[PDB]
Paper text:
Pol III transcribes short genes encoding for untranslated RNAs such as transfer RNAs (tRNA), the 5S ribosomal RNA (rRNA) and the U6 spliceosomal RNA. Pol III is composed of 17 subunits that are organized into four architectural units.
Accordingly, our yeast Pol III-DNA map, which lacks IN1, shows no density for C11-Ct and half of the linker. Additionally, residues R698 and Y701 in C128 switch their conformation to allow access of the C11 acidic loop, comprising residues 88-93 that are involved in RNA cleavage, into the active site (inset). Strikingly, focused classification of the Pol III-DNA bound to IN1 dataset showed that virtually all particles contain C11-Ct in the pore.
Author numbering:
A (entry chain G): 2 to 173, 189 to 212
B (entry chain D): 1 to 72, 91 to 161
C (entry chain A): 2 to 273, 280 to 334, 349 to 584
D (entry chain Q): 18 to 75, 101 to 161
E (entry chain B): 1051 to 1149
F (entry chain F): 71 to 153
G (entry chain A): 1364 to 1460
H (entry chain O): 25 to 384, 447 to 654
RNA sequence: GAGAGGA
DNA sequence: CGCTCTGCTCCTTCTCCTTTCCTCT
DNA sequence: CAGGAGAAGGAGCAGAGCG
């Protein structure tokens, strides 16, 4: 978790003029930055602080209060010096997707920088990895698994056409927008209890 | 909307937990608070809590993730105090870590030789003589 | 998931006029109109695949689809098409600009006709820190005169004369450009003149009957040669001609018709089918362009090809503007210019909603800053009042009343819903019970509401004033006669307009700036203009005449009469 | 008025090609001598892209890390100023941006006559 | 519409808008001549000031610079008629707020 | 460009009729959007009358940015302006 | 005020007001619009006619200024707040490792 | 049917609007220098003569340091031609132009290196051809070099001596010249400066007459103008003989660059040889080639004496230029030659024994006879000064060369009937359709078809003779002329745009597939393509390289086709 | 579309 | 010393405007 | 169908320089 520093413009409707101004500012910022991915920086958790608030301005047709504000948001962005635990939701023969307990389930780690003995198994989908004469070291679903993050992918493109939107709706894309690629080159991964 | 700084000063994974818990207390999102007034009885005072669904969900998920059982039934940071954090920073400043991996081992306190060796690059090559077991014995107690 | 979305309020900083460079015309387009026919003639008059009324260019009906935004007539902004011409033609709007560009350049090297020092000085004058339109136009005209003074190209070393309209006639002659190379060579030896003499000697040896026409017959600049010359004008010599070459489309060749932007069908709807003038004109343009293109490959007579080219040029000129030729199409120029054009009939002065117009009658008992309104029109002139926890009870009572009894309401718009819920039917009692704190009630006009009372012609500012509405049974806008001096009202059968502002801002500005009480003095001299009219001065004079002597009862009756 | 050399069959739709159909004869297969030039056209150009006079442009975290330490610098970037300059040619106002007082260093653009094209 | 057989409004022409200008009433002018007469929510591209449909520029084909704003439908009709000629009314936008 | 400090502000300390009408319109628009009022309501419902009553007691919480032609601007509080 | 006596005809106005839309609205619409397209004029919409045509707010009258609501927030809470982060950040670069 | 959403993408219509000069120059600078340099060159071409302040204002990348770095990058590579003018009213300002010769040098790099290697008889020895190729590559890529830096780069004494000898030989040959501030001053402004200091200095007494005063000023200015133009071409720096060992060595401190005029004269010689190869035998073509190589250094400049660009041509005295040129074209000592010199320098591999048949080696008589048959043709390949003495007339050979190239381009693109019609209209003058049919002997239907397809370019011009008060059709007549200047200019612009389009496509393809191109040099893995990359990457890289090779081959062909129109 | 009140 | 361009200045012949709209028919 | 006011080409002379 890392503090950011973002400057934005906040619309305060007259309904919220009675409460504290900072409370309304934080409410609107949360309405914009609660559990959403800020492009090129990751996912924002909660508006932490608030500093350098300029006097609000009114446009000639709405009657709200538009305030230019700066604040320090809470975002998650681990690059290299980290080890992250997670759970397992679904696995198939193209890698393993590691999930958390509600934060976000977008981390997918393939078997590129993983253990050499890992292999696929359509049945009892698992990550069998002998590494010795004993081959009973398969990865189980819904268990602690530690992994490193080697790189982060940002999907920040949208060249879609209205005709294409209508065609896809009649026929109904890369849903992820902030995913991290995992690595388990060193030991101690797979389960925090396997390595003592 | 322009991001003035893509990354400000780093935040330790102890201030975030207490900050979120205090935020839920102010907004009355505590499990005890919701079980007391909003559960097992009707709102006599009708003092409704904060009404942000997405914020409630994300803050509950992050506080639960920070308060899971420690990955070797609590995460240590749950019972960690500010003075315990001061003791921990003194102990870590007495040691040598190039990056701010000190905050990284604050994030997770595995208290294992293998995990501490893996968390920092070339732990054996950098220094592995007598202070590594001291690190493990002071990190076994989360305080 | 759910990446953030950020929006900011933005206003129109300012327009930047320019032309389209035959690459933005194609970029905007959805279909190339390449068929003279309009309807398929088989599937019950459906629009053709690439005709003028192609659906991809918009929808002219209320029960069709535009195939590009998939909306009805109300929700279709309209989409453009492109029509690629053959043998480009002059743009009638830029024809004088084309003349100036031709006068500013050679006809062999296609380079500007000013010396290096002269163009440096002129550019220095153009790039002064403060220059308006007038000084810039004067500088450009001086540049044009200076380059018209030139007799030889500085690079090609070719003779240059005068570039002028052919005959300034009605049709083709008004769009023909002739170059007179040999006007300024009086008696000096010019190699071009000798070449001309040799060429005409050759042709007269072959055909001697054209001797009488060797006079005149100047260098003719058809649109194709003009385009080929404009393609060679260096950008560094383009600022002196007035064209800013910094951005694309800032080229002299973008002012010659090579692609016609076919406007959306919304701009040129079909009435009851019966297509309007623009569709017919562009259909004719497509037909003539196809004829020219086919004749190019069929090897038609050069006379026929030139005649069809000229006919196409006249057709597109009429399309842009119907004043070009006499032999009543509503050209875009007709649609814009005029008293009823878009600028003077639709942009600077529109027809506004929530307005009425009725006869006027006097009403002395009505105080100034008030106007009496019929309840037959106070029940249609609704004001949108938003529930605000101060008038929730009043608004729900009005909803209960309904749209028939005057202190009621016509429409209810819920906070989240889009369509207005009419209060004419649907058990409005429960709707009043379910009146939230953000809904809008179109309440009937009532006492104390602000209205704009106006009488035409609006000679001065006091011809329109803001009054407080009152409700009276009759059918006439009744106003106190004292305020009839500003409007110049007559009560001889005069009529007046009454507008109802629909926002708190407009209403407050009307009642505080245009209020009758705040406009008792005319602005031209400051002398009062709202005061006693006829018969009020007579009553005052009869009361204050020295013969008047009142006892106590008569005095008290008078004092109860004035109050 | 349909012309003498045209009929109603050939007219009715205005189909302009919008695509060229008249090619120059310079599109034929390349020759060995022409294949050489190219290389001396790809090599030149490549050298000036690697050359100091480019200024073409119109991860990197501030956190110290032992991993980035003990790693060599990518190369010895040669800026525009470091190149030797004949001062009497350039305008005076550009002297403040060149290497008027800087260590001399010139890069030699070696030419490899062997083609770098695959196969 | 204009007549009385067609339920139409009263024309507030050039003289009336000049009278409104004389009072210096700006919000009332905006409400009368745009809000209560004809309001259209158009999508103008922030790069090339040409109106787009459904948040689609149709020229940049990016939908990133599209900005929604309300202008009179008469102005939109004028812009389309000018674009039908060889005139490009490229609207340049600036932030209303931010000082 | 910057705001002229309150200590010296050439603009008239009076309140022009245009500023008064705009303040009343803005306050009435805010009140019509369910905004709190700072005066004794006395049963009035139309937002314009509430705005007028608030301006009578100088209770309207708005300020005016008087934009000079150069670009600078003096911020005048409605309470400080005189009528 | 431009320097020379200028009438109130369509000729004297064309030498006073640069705004192409205003001149087109007054008189000689198509000629002015085509001239502004050719010379590539860059008018900034500030006149009342320009604002009315584009549905904006004028610069005269009530649109000659701005209305601003004071946030009225104290300086004793807007200051940055944190719980002793600089403790563990004792500048590890001070020591060798 | 192709929708416009696809036409805008795969029809090259967006770039079809760009001016060919601006398009070509910006594309070349972007490919060889970068994006900032491309933007600066684009502003220079679009506006012309911009100072640093105006360049900063007119570009979004308005960093003053960035603009100055771009300007020094363009000046060291002489892609710009600045000018330092002093304002009398106050502060002086320096204005920058766009240098066409430097951008052409960037354009002709491959051809320049090919000419350098081939013309010097050093490829045969196979040992210093690499050295001279590296020398010319460094000179053309770094802009301006002093010999001491190049020599100090190398260490071997033998290599140093070889490089110095090659420098001396190249400078003597004429491909390398001393670079001076004259190379960074516009010729038009140079003539403007030289017009004064010869007109102002005239005493305020009655000058002969104002027209005669200006004539005297022009006559005095042309002399020192030609002198200062030829000053870099005097070899005043190579003559540092005997510093030690008494050998001819170039002065170390003198900066040397490549002489574009010499290379373009070589290109003109090659074009003339190619033209002659279509009129005489292979042996006679070889004789003409060796004569051109002998007279190449002493030939007049390809473009002009540099006075045509400087000022207005004249009232009508522009012909004087021609005459003056013709005088030098006949009287430069190196130009005139006899068969003896050719026989002296003719290679022994040429048979030259049975080539010529008397009636239905290295013999002087046979070479003289071949020169006579060269001079006999209507094409002025050679002209006779004295009995048995020949000189190649460049003045009378440019128009015929341009006409032949243009006619053959028309013949290749359109049908041969197009060439027939163009030549018929050119030889005739103002010819109607009936006379066209009479003197061309083909179908009038195809005559009209070809005329319509040909008028699309500035090849055939329609002259309208009105037979009524109104000049409308169906009554007027339409004659046809040629106006070869329009045709030449339009075809030159067309070829420039085609070259710019090829370069734009090449850069686009390089950028699109840049990942594997970068990987090819990420770890110095060049030459190991098959043994390190995936087969799909192998195929993709092979296709990219072949496409770039074809692009540059077509660019070389376009250059060989447009040089003739570039001549004057 | 154009004939005419009307104020 | 007439001769021959420029340049200026008339002179003629051309183009764009003429409230408000407010109805009916 | 009248009235007003500009822009654009012929056309007739001064004026300058000249070989
Ligand atoms: Mg009356
Ligand atoms: Zn549509
Ligand atoms: Zn010319
Ligand atoms: Zn766009």
């Amino acid at each position: 978790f890392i503090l950011s520093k973002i400057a934005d413009l906040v619309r305060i409707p007259p309904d919220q003029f009675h409460r504290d101004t900072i409370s309304a500012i934080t409410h609107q910022l949360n309405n914009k930055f609660a559990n959403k991915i800020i492009p090129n920086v990751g996912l924002c958790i909660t508006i932490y602080d608030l500093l350098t608030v300029e006097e609000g301005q009114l446009k000639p047709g709405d009657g709200s209060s538009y305030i230019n504000v700066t604040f320090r948001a809470v975002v998650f962005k681990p690059f290299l010096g980290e080890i992250v635990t997670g759970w397992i939701s679904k696995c198939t023969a193209e890698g393993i997707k590691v999930s958390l307990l509600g934060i976000f389930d977008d981390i997918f780690i393939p078997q590129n920088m993983l253990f050499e003995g890992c292999y696929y198994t359509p049945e009892e989908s698992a990550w069998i990895w002998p590494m010795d004469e004993e081959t009973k070291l398969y990865f189980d679903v819904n268990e602690k698994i530690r992994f490193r993050i080697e790189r982060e992918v940002f999907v920040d493109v949208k060249p879609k056409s209205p005709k294409e939107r209508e065609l896809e709706e009649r026929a109904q894309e890369k849903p992820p927008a902030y995913a991290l690629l995992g690595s388990c080159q060193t030991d101690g991964m797979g389960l925090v209890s396997w390595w003592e | 909307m322009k991001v003035l700084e893509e990354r400000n000063a780093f935040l330790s994974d102890y201030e975030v937990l207490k900050f979120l818990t205090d935020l839920e207390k102010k907004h009355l999102w505590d499990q005890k608070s919701l079980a007391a007034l909003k559960k097992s009885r009707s709102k006599g005072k009708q003092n409704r809590p904060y009404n942000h669904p997405e914020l409630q969900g994300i803050t509950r998920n992050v506080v639960n993730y920070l308060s899971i059982n420690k990955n070797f039934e609590k995460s240590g940071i749950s019972k960690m105090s500010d003075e315990s954090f001061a003791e921990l920073m003194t102990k870590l400043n007495s040691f040598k870590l190039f990056k701010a991996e000190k905050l990284q081992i604050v994030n997770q306190l595995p208290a294992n030789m293998v995990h501490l060796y893996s968390i920092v690059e070339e732990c054996d090559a950098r220094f592995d003589e007598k202070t590594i077991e001291e690190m493990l014995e002071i990190i076994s107690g989360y305080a | 998931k759910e990446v953030v979305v950020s929006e900011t309020p933005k206003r129109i900083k300012g327009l930047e006029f320019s032309a389209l460079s035959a690459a933005d015309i194609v970029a905007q387009s959805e279909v190339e109109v390449s068929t003279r026919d309009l309807f398929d003639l088989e599937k019950d008059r459906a629009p053709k695949a690439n005709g003028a009324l192609d659906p991809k260019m918009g929808v002219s009906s209320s029960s069709l689809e535009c195939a590009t935004c998939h909306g009805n007539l109300a929700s279709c902004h309209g989409h453009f098409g492109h029509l690629k011409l053959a043998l480009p033609v002059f743009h009638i709007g830029y024809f004088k600009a084309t003349i100036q560009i031709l006068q500013g350049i050679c006809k062999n090297c296609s380079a500007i006709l000013l010396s290096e020092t002269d163009k440096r000085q002129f550019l220095h004058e153009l790039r002064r820190p403060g220059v308006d339109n007038l000084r810039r136009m004067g500088i450009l005209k001086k540049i044009l005169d200076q380059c018209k003074k030139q007799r030889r190209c500085l690079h090609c070393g070719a003779l240059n004369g005068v570039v002028k309209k052919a005959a300034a006639g009605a049709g083709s002659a008004a769009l023909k450009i002739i170059h007179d190379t040999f006007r300024w060579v009086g008696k000096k030896s010019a190699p071009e003149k000798d070449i001309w003499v040799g060429e005409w000697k050759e042709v007269l040896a072959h055909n001697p009957e054209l001797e009488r026409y060797v006079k005149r017959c100047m260098d003719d600049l058809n649109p194709l040669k003009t385009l080929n010359l404009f393609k060679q004008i260096k950008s560094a010599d383009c600022e002196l001609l007035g064209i800013d070459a910094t951005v694309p489309s800032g080229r002299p060749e973008t002012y010659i018709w090579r692609y016609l932007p076919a406007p959306p069908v919304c701009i040129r709807p079909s009435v009851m089918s019966n297509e309007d003038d623009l569709t017919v004109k562009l259909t004719e343009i497509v037909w003539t362009s196809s004829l020219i293109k086919a004749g190019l490959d069929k090897g038609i007579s050069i006379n026929n090809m030139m005649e069809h080219w000229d006919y196409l040029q006249l057709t597109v000129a009429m399309y842009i503007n119907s004043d070009s030729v006499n032999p009543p199409i509503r050209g875009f120029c007709q649609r814009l210019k005029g008293k009823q054009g878009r600028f003077r009939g639709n942009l600077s002065g529109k027809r506004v909603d929530f307005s009425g117009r009725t006869v006027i009658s006097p009403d002395p008992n009505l105080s100034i800053d008030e106007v009496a309104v019929p309840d037959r029109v106070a029940k249609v002139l609704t004001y949108p009042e938003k529930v605000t926890r101060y008038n929730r009870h009043k608004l729900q009572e009005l909803i209960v009343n309904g749209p028939n009894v005057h202190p009621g309401a016509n429409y209810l718009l819920k906070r989240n819903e889009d369509a207005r819920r009419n209060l004419r039917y649907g058990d409005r009692m429960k709707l009043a019970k379910n009146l939230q704190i953000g809904d809008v009630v179109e309440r009937h006009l009532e006492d104390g509401d602000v209205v704009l009372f106006n009488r035409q012609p609006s000679l001065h500012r006091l011809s329109i004033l803001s009054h407080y509405a009152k409700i009276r049974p009759w059918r006439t806008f009744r106003l106190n006669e004292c305020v009839c001096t500003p409007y110049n009202a007559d009560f001889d059968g005069d009529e007046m307009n009454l507008h109802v502002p629909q926002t708190e801002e407009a209403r407050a500005e009307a009642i505080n700036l245009m209020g009758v009480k705040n406009n008792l003095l005319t602005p031209k001299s400051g002398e009062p203009i709202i005061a006693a009219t006829q018969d009020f001065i007579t009553g005052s004079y009869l009361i204050s005449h020295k013969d008047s002597f009142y006892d106590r009862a008569t005095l008290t009756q008078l004092l109860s009469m004035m109050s | 008025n349909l012309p003498f050399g045209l009929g109603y069959g050939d007219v009715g739709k205005n189909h302009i090609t919008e695509f060229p159909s008249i090619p120059l004869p310079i599109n034929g297969p390349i020759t060995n001598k022409e294949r050489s030039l190219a290389v001396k056209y790809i090599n030149f150009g490549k050298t000036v892209k690697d050359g100091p006079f480019y200024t073409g442009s119109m991860t990197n975290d501030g956190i110290e890390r032992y991993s980035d330490k003990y790693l060599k610098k990518r190369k010895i970037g040669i800026s525009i100023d470091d190149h030797p300059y004949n001062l009497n040619l350039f305008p005076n106002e550009l002297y403040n941006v060149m290497g008027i007082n800087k260590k001399k260093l010139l890069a030699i653009s070696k030419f490899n006559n062997a083609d770098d094209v695959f196969t | 519409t204009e007549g009385r057989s067609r339920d139409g409004g009263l024309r507030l022409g050039e003289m009336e808008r000049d009278c409104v200008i004389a009072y210096g009433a700006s919000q009332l002018l905006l409400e009368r001549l745009m809000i209560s007469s004809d309001a259209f929510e158009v999508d103008v591209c922030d790069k090339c000031g040409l109106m787009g449909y459904s948040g689609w520029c149709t020229t940049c084909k990016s939908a990133e610079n599209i900005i929604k704003m309300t202008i009179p439908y008469a102005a939109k009709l004028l812009f389309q008629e000018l674009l039908s000629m060889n005139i490009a009314p490229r609207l340049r936008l600036e932030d209303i707020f931010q000082q | 460009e910057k705001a002229i400090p309150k200590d010296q502000r050439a603009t008239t300390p009076y309140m022009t009729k245009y500023e008064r009408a705009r303040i009343l319109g803005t306050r009435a628009l805010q009140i019509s959007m369910n905004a709190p009022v700072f005066v004794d309501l006395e049963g009035e419902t139309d937002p314009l009358r509430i705005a007028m009553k608030e301006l009578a007691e100088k209770k309207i919480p708005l300020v005016i940015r008087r934009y000079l032609p150069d670009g600078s601007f003096e911020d005048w509080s409605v309470e400080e302006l005189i009528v | 005020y431009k320097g020379e006596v200028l009438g109130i005809t369509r000729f004297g106005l064309s030498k006073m007001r640069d705004s192409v839309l205003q001149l087109a609205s007054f008189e000689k619409t198509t000629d002015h619009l085509f001239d502004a397209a050719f010379y590539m004029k860059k008018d900034a919409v500030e006149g009342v006619s320009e604002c009315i045509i584009l549905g904006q707010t004028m610069s005269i009258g009530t649109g000659s200024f701005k209305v601003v609501k004071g946030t009225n927030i104290s300086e004793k809470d807007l200051v940055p707040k944190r719980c002793l982060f600089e403790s563990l950040s004792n500048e590890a670069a001070l020591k060798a490792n | 049917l192709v929708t416009p959403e696809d036409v805008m993408t795969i029809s090259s219509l967006e770039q079809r609007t760009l001016n060919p000069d601006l398009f070509l120059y910006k594309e070349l600078v972007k490919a060889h220098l970068g994006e900032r340099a491309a933007s600066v060159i684009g502003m220079l071409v679009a506006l012309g003569r911009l100072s640093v302040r105006e360049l900063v204002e007119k570009i979004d990348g308005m960093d003053v340091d960035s603009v100055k770095t771009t300007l020094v990058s363009l000046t060291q590579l002489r892609c710009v031609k600045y000018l330092q003018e002093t304002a009398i009213s106050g502060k002086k300002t320096t204005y920058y132009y766009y240098n066409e010769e430097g951008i052409h040098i960037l354009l002709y790099s491959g051809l320049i290196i090919d000419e350098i290697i081939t013309q010097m008889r050093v490829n045969d020895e196979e040992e210093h051809k690499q050295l001279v190729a590296e020398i010319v590559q460094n000179v053309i890529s770094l802009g301006s070099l002093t010999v001491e830096d190049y020599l100090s780069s190398v260490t071997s004494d033998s290599m140093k001596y070889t490089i110095s000898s090659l420098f001396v030989q190249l400078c003597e040959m004429g491909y390398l010249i001393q670079i001076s501030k004259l190379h960074y001053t516009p010729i038009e402004d140079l003539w403007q400066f030289l017009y004064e200091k010869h007109y102002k200095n005239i005493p305020r007494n009655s000058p002969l007459s104002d027209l005669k005063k200006r004539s005297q000023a022009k006559m005095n200015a042309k002399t020192d103008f030609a002198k200062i133009i030829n000053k870099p071409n005097e070899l005043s720096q190579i003559l540092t003989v005997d510093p030690k060992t008494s050998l001819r060595i170039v002065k170390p401190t003198v900066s040397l660059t490549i002489n574009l005029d010499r290379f373009m004269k070589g290109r003109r010689s090659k074009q003339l040889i190619n033209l002659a190869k279509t009129r005489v035998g292979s042996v006679t073509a070889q004789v003409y080639k060796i004569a051109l190589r002998l007279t190449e250094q002493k030939s007049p400049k390809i473009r002009d004496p540099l006075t045509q660009t400087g000022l207005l041509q004249d009232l009508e005295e522009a012909k004087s230029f021609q005459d003056e040129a013709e005088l030098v074209e006949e009287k430069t000592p190196g130009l005139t030659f006899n068969a003896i010199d050719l026989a002296r320098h003719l290679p022994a591999e040429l048979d030259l024994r049975g080539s010529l048949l008397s009636r239905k080696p290295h013999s002087a008589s046979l070479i003289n006879s071949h020169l006579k048959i060269l001079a006999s043709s209507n094409f002025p390949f050679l002209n006779e000064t004295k009995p048995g003495v020949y000189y190649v007339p460049y003045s009378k050979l440019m128009p015929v060369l341009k006409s032949s190239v243009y006619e053959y381009v028309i013949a290749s693109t359109l049908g041969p009937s197009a060439m027939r019609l163009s030549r018929c209209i050119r030889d005739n003058k103002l010819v109607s359709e009936k006379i066209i049919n009479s003197t061309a002997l083909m179908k009038e239907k195809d005559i009209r078809s070809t005329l319509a397809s040909l008028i699309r370019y500035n090849s055939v011009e329609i002259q309208e003779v009105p037979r009524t008060a109104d000049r409308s059709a169906s009554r007027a007549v339409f004659l046809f002329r040629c106006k070869e200047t329009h045709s030449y200019n339009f075809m030159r612009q067309n070829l420039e745009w085609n070259m710019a389009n090829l370069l734009f496509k090449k850069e686009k393809l390089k950028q699109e597939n840049s990942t594997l191109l970068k990987k090819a040099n990420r770890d110095d893995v060049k030459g190991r393509e098959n043994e390190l990359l995936l087969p799909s990457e192998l195929n993709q890289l092979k296709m990219v390289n072949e496409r770039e090779l074809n692009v540059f081959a077509r660019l070389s062909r376009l250059l060989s086709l447009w040089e003739v129109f570039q001549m004057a």
